[PDB]
């Protein structure tokens, strides 16, 4: 669970990072697809499932919007993300093992764009935060 130091760590980082949220979501989502082909299935209904693609660029905005939401509801991720859990488990039926993957890709992207910002200390708290998000999202699977 996140401590006060963790919650503060994430808010401080997010305030420097938030402006590039859409860049991060697109790059991250592109990487995931290329590096972990197994995740290409879920976006197969899109015409262009490649790095440039307008759908990827569009969806990346939404994924980061979800993260922005998680940041606001940090004190209670489970209830803040209930609906999204519901949606991924029943409507999209997204295998839960993939949340670990995307989280990894986002950390890499943030590292790529904010190397001076992403210190080991920020890293620990952001990883704890992202795990909690992954955990909140699996809530409604079983």
């Amino acid at each position: 669970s996140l401590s006060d130091k963790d919650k503060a760590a994430v808010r401080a980082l997010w305030s420097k990072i938030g402006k590039s949220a859409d860049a991060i979501g697109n790059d991250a989502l592109s990487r995931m697809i290329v590096v972990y082909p197994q995740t290409k299935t879920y976006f197969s209904h899109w015409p262009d499932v490649t790095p440039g693609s307008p759908h990827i660029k569009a969806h990346g905005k939404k994924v980061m919007g979800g993260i922005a939401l998680a940041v606001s509801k940090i004190d209670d991720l489970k209830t803040g993300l209930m609906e999204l859990s519901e949606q991924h488990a029943y409507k999209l039926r997204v295998d839960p093992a993939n949340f670990k993957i995307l989280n990894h890709c986002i950390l890499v992207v943030i590292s790529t764009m904010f190397p001076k910002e992403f210190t080991p200390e920020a890293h620990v708290s952001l990883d704890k935060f992202l795990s909690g998000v992954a955990l909140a999202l699996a809530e409604r699977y079983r």
Binding site: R31, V34, V35, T112, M113, P115, P120, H123
Partner: protein
């Protein structure tokens, strides 16, 4: 494992422009701060400790050894595997964790050059190297 010429080029490119004294220490410091339980293997702030910096360097050199023998990787590490396994008491899981840290530190070094294709090659290489290490 199957390697393509492209992958051979990319990994060779990465390791020939890498600065071991910088990446090594940073990658180990991060792992010990992000995954605190690995710290029990250095029973004697973490980012400044010379003994940590030292093994960090050793790790990267140990990898470099694998870059030269991309086709005979399992044999190449058999010994180092036993070292960590039988004597140091390393949980195989700790290798996969260090693996991620090395990737993250490298990404912050190469910035926009750490393209998705480069990530793919670098991760696949660490994968094979981690299996070998957590097999004996």
């Amino acid at each position: 494992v199957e390697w393509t010429d492209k992958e051979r080029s990319i990994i060779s490119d990465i390791f020939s422009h890498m600065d071991y004294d910088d990446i090594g220490p940073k990658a180990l410091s991060r792992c010990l701060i992000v995954y605190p339980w690995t710290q029990r293997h250095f029973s004697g702030a973490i980012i400044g400790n010379a003994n940590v910096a030292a093994h960090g360097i050793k790790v990267l050199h140990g990898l470099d050894r694998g870059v030269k023998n991309m086709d005979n990787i399992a044999a190449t590490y058999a010994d180092l595997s036993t070292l960590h396994s039988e004597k140091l008491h390393v949980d195989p899981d700790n290798f996969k964790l260090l693996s991620d840290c090395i990737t993250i530190v490298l990404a912050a070094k190469m910035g926009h050059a750490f393209t998705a294709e480069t990530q793919g090659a670098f991760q696949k290489f660490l994968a094979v190297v981690v299996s070998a290490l957590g097999k004996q």
